[PDB]
Symmetry: D2
Subunit: 388 residues, 4 copies
């Protein structure tokens, strides 16, 4: 008996019209909106009011920027994971959105939760794996998989029919996602990989041709694998990300133009901006090269893909992830020190690093003989053979 539904509400046209749609298809159902502040830099008061004006009985706005940075982005930094060796995994936000939706749903005695992810992308998997992992008893409603709205023009017609304001502004040329960690752009003319990136895509990163002609030095202090200070100033994760995004963005750093494999089974061409992320990944990699032994570094690097795939596929809320985090946290115990980097014209240039736990500071013949003994034996057995 669906009497009450919690909707992950982003403020767009689509989730706005899902409020009356949900109330139409679940008779006398009350709809509560859940709005997360992830750093998308939108007017959340206006989004809250729009949810209420659209028919929600309540509209929660939850500021999750610090929780996102400390509970999601910091473990990701520690993992060093890049999906398919290229993608900075900004959709790590989806399980956090799901977590807040489920938390509020359970305090509001709702029967079902809903989200506005489309029927063709990855985000629907991320949302629904997370919801099942957190609250297997909650019904999930995905209007894009059910309703007859097929186009933006149809959504606009429906919006006007239900008193939802639709002012004229052209269709966005690109489908975008924005949080404190990244900006993603896909769709439209981007879906043709034979074409270069158009010049109106980037939103927070300067094209290299307009970057400063003087390099900028940044000094990052890390403790146990995460950054705690910038240029000698202790900063919260959010403040450090904000400052580093501004600096590295001004210097054109961090743009990735990639073709990736979706979980749903097709390839997509995406543009990703993440200036601070690129700088943090570089500094973290340098410190690990100083502070981990060879065997630890090699084993940890061999698990980056596993971690990246888990994040990409929405499997954050799993024992598998818990076990990887426990492995990673051990490896990060001594990843503590100072990394100086020069930002300049899209480049992150090493400028020195140090750590109180730096490992940088007749035997050879015996090592060589025993290291190569199996090769010597093999070649004696296969005399005259080659390795072609």
């Amino acid at each position: 008996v669906i009497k009450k539904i919690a909707l992950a509400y982003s403020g767009g046209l689509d989730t706005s019209i899902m409020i009356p749609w949900l109330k139409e298809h679940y008779e006398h159902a009350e709809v509560i909106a859940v709005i997360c502040d992830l750093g998308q830099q939108e007017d959340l008061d206006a989004i809250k009011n729009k949810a209420l004006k659209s028919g929600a009985s309540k509209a929660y706005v939850v500021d999750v920027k610090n929780e996102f940075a400390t509970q999601y982005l910091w473990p990701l930094v520690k993992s060093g994971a890049l999906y398919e060796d290229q993608y900075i995994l900004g959709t790590i936000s989806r399980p956090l959105i799901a977590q807040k939706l489920v938390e509020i749903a359970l305090t509001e005695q709702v029967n079902a939760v809903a989200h506005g992810a489309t029927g063709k992308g990855n985000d629907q998997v991320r949302f629904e794996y997370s919801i099942k992992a957190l609250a297997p008893q909650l019904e999930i409603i995905a209007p894009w998989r059910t309703w007859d709205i097929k186009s933006r023009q149809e959504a606009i017609v429906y919006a006007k029919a239900h008193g939802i304001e639709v002012p004229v502004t052209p269709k966005a040329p690109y489908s975008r996602d924005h949080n404190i960690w990244y900006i993603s752009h896909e769709g439209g003319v981007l879906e043709d990989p034979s074409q270069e990136m158009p010049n109106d895509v980037l939103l927070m990163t300067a094209p290299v041709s307009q970057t400063p002609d003087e390099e900028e030095v940044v000094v990052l202090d890390f403790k146990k694998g995460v950054p705690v200070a910038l240029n000698g100033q202790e900063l919260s994760p959010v403040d450090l990300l904000n400052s580093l995004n501004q600096k590295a963005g001004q210097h054109g750093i961090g743009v990735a133009d990639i073709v990736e494999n979706r979980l749903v089974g097709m390839k997509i061409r995406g543009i990703y901006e993440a200036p601070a992320a690129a700088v943090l990944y570089k500094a973290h990699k340098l410190l690990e090269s100083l502070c981990l032994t060879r065997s630890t570094l090699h084993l940890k690097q061999s698990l980056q893909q596993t971690y990246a795939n888990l994040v990409y596929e929405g499997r954050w809320f799993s024992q598998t992830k818990q076990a990887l985090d426990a492995f990673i946290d051990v490896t990060q115990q001594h990843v503590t020190g100072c990394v100086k980097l020069k930002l300049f014209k899209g480049n992150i240039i090493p400028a020195g690093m140090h750590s109180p736990y730096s490992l940088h500071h007749k035997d050879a013949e015996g090592f060589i003989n025993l290291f190569s003994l199996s090769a010597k034996i093999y070649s004696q057995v296969h005399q005259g053979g080659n390795y072609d």
Copy 2:
């Protein structure tokens, strides 16, 4: 009796004095010098003549640039491997040097082979693993592990006592290696990772502040994972690497400043220049992302570290490498197409790609996939009711 020794001879003071040293410690032994042209851009006829003036009975100069490109660098490009996710592995040349040394050693019926790799580095392992893999019967002599010479001034004293001319110009401030693929710099003041790279290190790459203010477009055509044309012009591998090294180096591309783990058990700070290698790695990665399925891409990426460690450790001549190469060659069958890149201020910027084998092209399907993909998570959370994942 050791009557004949083949020496891998690079032309420095050290391998020059190894010639009388070997003749002294192996009485009446004749020494044959083997010099490889790997693209180090040195006067090899001068090096040949110095080998003979130093007491070598014969001095071979073998031009192996083409074979280095096709038999080593092209498999490396196909692998996509980077040691510790950073190093472009220019010492992939060491097994080739060992291969030419052994080939000549067997032709000349020598009793032993010798090399001048130092006793503290990786190159001695690379040479000696390769020699044992190719010719386990040959004795190996490494003078740096046997002789009493410890410093350059000690080598100079020895050279004077043994009729070896000492070059006027001193040893560079850095230990360097140079071939068509890369230039490496280590040692000296580079052994302090707390300092930035000095301004006198780079030899083939412009500093980014001194790069052109206009971008340059390059177009690379690939066939089965390797580049066959640049800007619409079919080029041999060596000509293509040469051209791309010039273009990308002019635009400041490809400098790596890293701390790596040696095989011999300690970390070293190195500077690596490899402009064309960076451009080819980028283009190859882009084309794989278009032409491989997800499962093939993910499996191949998971073997890159294995390949990189094998190359770094000198294990090129092994059945393990042969098996990896067979796997890689299958995955490269359709990595064929065109990649356009912009070179600019140290950046390699995607400018479009296409492939006749590109794999890039209902709502009811998604709900079923979601439910079964997530079923195990739903069962787990029902069993551990109320549990967190903290």
Copy 3:
């Protein structure tokens, strides 16, 4: 328009009633049946006649036992793969069934292919992945996912209303699959892992208490990773498997009782009989331990899970599988020799092995190896003075 359908036909009641059901739901479609002889040891003439009596216009019976052994089981033996470290993967037959279904469909102007795998299992994924990999243009029809028949009694009602004869003998208490490599049992009272295996499950393996009191020696010759002779007699793959299944089954060998993760999201309890497979896996493992270097063995063992998952998931017809097969075939080049084993009371006991390519054959070297192998540990403990590894 779907005018003609090829149905993978096993001869049970369910695939029999699918023939009239397909004709009802695809207006006047012709249905041809494809029956594979995989070693299920059934009366294939009776199955062929039952397909025709049920309304099939044609019923092909294809003997695929040699193709199965040489093109599927031999690569599997070479891989050493066991799904979740326990399961011998007898459903490697499903891509072969799909391959014959498609081969015949494309000689018969067929528009759609059909199979009788249930909607809850793995086999439907295996069939339909394979069909899409081989012939993406063919439509696929799975009646269990579409029709309203939900029980055996409902199937019987439907058979009676459509002229399909109902067998006198009931449904077996277990869902079974049988080919030359294995017999699988699941469902029924087996779906309680808290209970031991009932005494009426096993079909080709003696209970251990009912095995001979004298051991039996078998001698297996291998060439390039696959068995070519048994007790000094060269035997075809099918004859060797048949003989070894009889011998090892009589000695109680090869029963696995496991809980496995399905691809479709849930765990299942299965009983698997595969006597010859257990013996061949053991002999192959022993010879690899003799003929492979350490690095090759370790790398190959690290890919067994990948291969096992690929087979289990039905991804046989993929470039990923082709690349793995290329890797594996290199590693098998020297896996050639003789393994003697004692079969006794459910045990496979090594009794000696040899190979012309066996790799089994100073104190000063050890100290240097130890010091450099341990140098990284010494540096770390000097840096972290007073620490522990708790």
Copy 4:
């Protein structure tokens, strides 16, 4: 700087007995402290202590480490599920513990050096010395087998007699053995020919299958967080449970492995290993994991078993790499809690039921899952139209 005191890992053999006078000879006025560990080798340790004192040791410690061997070494090993090269139960996991106790006493006694009696050709010298460097990088290590002029057992006997050490006539053991609560190892002698079956005088704790009981024996194992806590309904300490299970499973002929393994020191060795309780615990642990872990956790954990096994085999126990693996493993073991019933019979460990409070064992969706799971295969086959996967 002058070596005044040496701590020696002292086993009671002839070899470490004569190392006390040898050490005192080669390090003038040095005293020798013997360190004897109780690992379950079932020897008279007070007699070994007395022999050390009689041979000239100033102090002789006997450290009972059986409980901590089980809880700090064997229990993590059981939780890992690791087998070296998929065959070896890793009984030399004891070597880092021996080194740890040696180093503790070394530091307490303010000695200048530690010594051990491992030979120059084996793995144990690496295990001891890696551990010693990881725990105490400042301590000098003395390995007399790598230094002294004693080459044979007969020479060791001559030396013992010239230095007052009792050598009564008792013939050379035909095999080199190691024994602790976890396993017994046998190698050397006629075992070094893999073409020969195991001789009938090898086994010491495991019945040959032909003399095992004719009635099966049920054991019930309760596990909590991946380790056994009770046997047949009785809570037992780890040592008591291992002792009881070794007796029961040994009586039923369980757990003998006859293998060829790759040494770290670069060559293969043929070994016989007995470990009855270990085989039973490994089987029970594997069954419980199959019930309680999700598929993705099981697959990832199984993929790290080889890493863990190699680390243990190579002596790298005292490392951050091991600590990180243990942290991963411990998370996966949090719900590996429940009851496994097994039948021991004639060398077989037969599943007889399992249950757990955390067991994970309990039409339209399947089509959508199939279509998206197989979409990349369909796209690939449309691009490579009509292609094959041979």
